[PDB]
Design a protein around this ligand. Structure first.
Ligand SMILES: [Ca+2]
Ligand SMILES: [Ca+2]
Ligand SMILES: [Ca+2]
Ligand SMILES: [Ca+2]
Ligand SMILES: [Ca+2]
Length: 102
């Protein structure tokens, strides 16, 4: 099983978490493609010690709802996609993100 490419979009438009964003939920999104990545593979994000999870869609994208306060307290995290091949062998593909907090 072969690793793909996981990327993480900007954390909101400007890649900054402001006080008003910190108050609620923030959709964190990105892409997962290439290698053996496929639809329904899990994407796992640890943000401020909290584990946030979603799955890959048919177009190689993902989106998860994160508490904005977790984002205000953690300025960097990896998104990790777990894939397998036809024989069952698994692989992890990691993408990284930073953002800033105002
Ligand atoms: Ca960023
Ligand atoms: Ca923002
Ligand atoms: Ca972190
Ligand atoms: Ca400031
Ligand atoms: Ca400011």
């Amino acid at each position: 099983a072969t690793a793909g490419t996981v990327t993480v979009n900007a954390i909101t438009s400007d890649d900054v978490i402001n006080a008003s964003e910190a108050a609620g939920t923030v959709a964190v999104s990105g892409t997962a493609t290439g290698g053996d990545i496929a639809e329904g593979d899990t994407v796992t994000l640890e943000i401020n010690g909290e584990t946030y999870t979603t799955t890959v869609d048919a177009n190689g994208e993902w989106s998860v709802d994160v508490a904005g306060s977790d984002l205000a307290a953690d300025t960097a995290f990896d998104a990790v996609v777990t894939s397998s091949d036809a024989a069952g062998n698994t692989v992890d593909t990691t993408g990284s993100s930073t953002h800033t907090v105002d």
